[PDB]
Amino acid sequence: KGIYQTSNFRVQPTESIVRFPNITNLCPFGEVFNATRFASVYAWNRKRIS
């Protein structure tokens, strides 16, 4: 006979929610991977992907 503390509760997850910006275009990985000429290691090229 007495009062007993138990485990904390929270509501179980029901579904998964994904919220992303509605961007449609694809960056050209073809000009990165299927590129013709590659720069040297002392003059390595950096391309911005955004």
């Binding site: 503390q5 485990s7 904390n8 929270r10 997850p13």
Partner: protein, 49 residues
Amino acid sequence: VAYSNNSIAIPTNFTISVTTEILPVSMTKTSVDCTMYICGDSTECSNLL
């Protein structure tokens, strides 16, 4: 103290004084859920616990 072998001092009046004394009695009753504090709502982390 003006001590002597035949001299004594007797008070002729008195003063009633009130002094304040403060003592702690209780403490804030805290309760911690160990599973929640270690990692919340994670079943994989709870399995490792």
